[PDB]
């Protein structure tokens, strides 16, 4: 049984930290593609 | 074969329909007798 309310499992990540980390990743990633490109991130597509 | 209903039919949040209350027989210590077991399963583990 559940000794209380049913709640959704979840996980929190700091928003500013993630945005800064992703910015660092793009800054380093551009070195292999060029400084006049657009780097876009998207979620996964197929599979289970 | 499991006979399942929704665990929390009045939930108006996520987890609505994610946890199912499934009835099944299952064996006991002796091969001549069966029991009746009620348990909850997550939707991802159970297919219709």
């Amino acid at each position: 049984d559940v000794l209380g309310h049913v709640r959704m499992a979840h996980c929190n990540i700091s928003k500013a930290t993630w945005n800064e980390t992703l910015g660092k990743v793009v800054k380093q990633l551009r070195k292999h593609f060029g400084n006049n490109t657009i780097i876009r991130f998207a979620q996964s597509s197929g599979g289970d | 074969t499991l006979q399942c209903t929704n665990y929390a039919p009045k939930l108006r949040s996520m987890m609505r329909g994610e946890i199912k209350n499934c009835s099944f027989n299952m064996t006991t210590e002796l091969r001549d007798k069966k029991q009746k077991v009620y348990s909850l399963f997550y939707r991802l583990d159970v297919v219709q």
Partner: antibody
Amino acid sequence: LQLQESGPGLVKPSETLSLTCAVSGGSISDYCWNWIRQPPGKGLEWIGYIGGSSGSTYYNPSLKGRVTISADTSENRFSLKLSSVTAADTAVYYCARSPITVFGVVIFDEYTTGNLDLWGPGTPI
Amino acid sequence: DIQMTQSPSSLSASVGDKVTITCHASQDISSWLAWYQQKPGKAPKPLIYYASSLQSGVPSRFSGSGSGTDYTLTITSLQPEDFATYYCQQYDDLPFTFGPGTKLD
């Protein structure tokens, strides 16, 4: 805190009715918003509601399909659309505010609501 | 679709009388019952939420209680502003429903 509705005073058969409600003195994200119908001489019928910060919507099994409820927090407003309006849908429509008692994550609708604390003037249709 | 009834459908009363309005649910609603007062031509206004909790701004003359399937609203002094149609709202489960209403006269 005042709620004020608007929209056409009547639509023709098979047209979509679009009603709006403005929130003045408060913020949509902290409350849930309900729409209630009252045909003339009859009692109250719940149409549906939309949450605040979660954006989730729920509809009555009556008025099956047809009903769309939405909100726009950038203008602190929300609206109701009813497609394929017929003669039986003429009524006074109200918007209303409901409180949220939060026990879990608000963005997952982990709260108890349903009480109506504030009613608008009403819009006869 | 939870059903709700009210009793009486019309209650005869004079000014200053103590009155009780009852509501009967088809199933236990765990006290998640709200009471509203509606006047002709106006939107209903709140009185009570969660069966017994009084809404802020509502005179202390209004009270109520109940459990299970049986709930009551008590008005201790029926002043002229209180001759209104009263409604029960059941929010324990969705869709939300309302009773037929009881008229005071």
